[PDB]
Amino acid sequence: EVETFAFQAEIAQLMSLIINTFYSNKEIFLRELISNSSDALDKIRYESLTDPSKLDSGKELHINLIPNKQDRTLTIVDTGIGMTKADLINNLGTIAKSGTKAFMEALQAGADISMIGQFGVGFYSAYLVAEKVTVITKHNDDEQYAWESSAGGSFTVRTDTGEPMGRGTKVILHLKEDQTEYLEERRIKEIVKKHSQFIGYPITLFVEK
Numbered sequence: 001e002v003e004t005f006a007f008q009a010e011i012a013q014l015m016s017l018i019i020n021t022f023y024s025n026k027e028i029f030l031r032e033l034i035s036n037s038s039d040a041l042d043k044i045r046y047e048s049l050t051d052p053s054k055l056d057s058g059k060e061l062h063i064n065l066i067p068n069k070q071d072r073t074l075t076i077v078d079t080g081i082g083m084t085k086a087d088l089i090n091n092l093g094t095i096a097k098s099g100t101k102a103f104m105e106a107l108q109a110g111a112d113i114s115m116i117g118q119f120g121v122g123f124y125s126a127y128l129v130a131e132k133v134t135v136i137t138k139h140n141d142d143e144q145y146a147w148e149s150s151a152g153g154s155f156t157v158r159t160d161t162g163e164p165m166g167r168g169t170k171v172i173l174h175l176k177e178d179q180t181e182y183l184e185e186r187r188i189k190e191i192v193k194k195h196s197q198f199i200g201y202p203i204t205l206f207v208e209k
C-alpha cells in the first residue's frame, strides 16, 4: 500500500525555489544532511541516558556516506532516533517547527541558499543535487517506512520491508545527471573536511567495490 500526500503549500514553494534558483554553491547539501544526522544522534544519545533499552536497536552512534556510481546515488545513513510514520509525514510534509517562512522572506532580503540550515529546512537542499530523494527511517516506537519525492508538490509513504535497519534514517539522493561529482571519493572528502570537520560522531566514507 502506497499513500500519496501533498506537501503543505509553503514547503512546495521552498522546494521550487531550491530547484529553480540559479545558485552554484550546491555542495552545502551534504553539510545540511550530516547536521540533521548529528542532531538525530544527539537525540537518541540523550534519551538513552534515562532509558538504556532505547539502545537495544543498536548502541553505535555514527554516520555513513555511501556513494554508488552504478545506481547514481549518494546515501547518508545515521543510527539516530529516526521517525515514526507520523513524525515522517509532519517533518517532511509540513512547515512543522521549521523556519520555512523566515527563509523564503530572507531570500528576498539578501540571504542566500547556503544559509538554509539556520532555518531548520536544510534537508531540502538535497534538491540542489537530486532529482529524487528517498528517506528510509526506523524509530524504536514504530515499523520501518520509506518516504519519497521527486518534488512536483507530492510525496509518498509506504512501509519498507526486506532490508531492516536497527534504528535511524537513510537519505538516498538519486543524483541529477550533471551532479555526479558528488559520487567521487575525493570530492566527498573535500566537502566533509570543509564543512563537517567538527561533527561529534564518526563519519565513514564507504569505498566502492
Ligand SMILES: NC(=O)CCCSc1nc(N)nc(-c2c(Cl)cc3c4c(cccc24)COC3)n1
Binding pocket: 036, 037, 039, 040, 043, 078, 080, 081, 082, 083, 087, 091, 092, 098, 120, 121, 122, 123, 124, 135, 169, 171
Ligand atoms: N533531531 C530530532 O529531534 C529528530 C528528528 C527526526 S530523525 C531525523 N534524522 C535525519 N537524519 N533527518 C531528519 C530530517 C529529515 Cl530526513 C527531513 C527534514 C527534517 C526537518 C527537521 C529535522 C529533521 C529532519 C525538517 O526538514 C525536513 N530527521
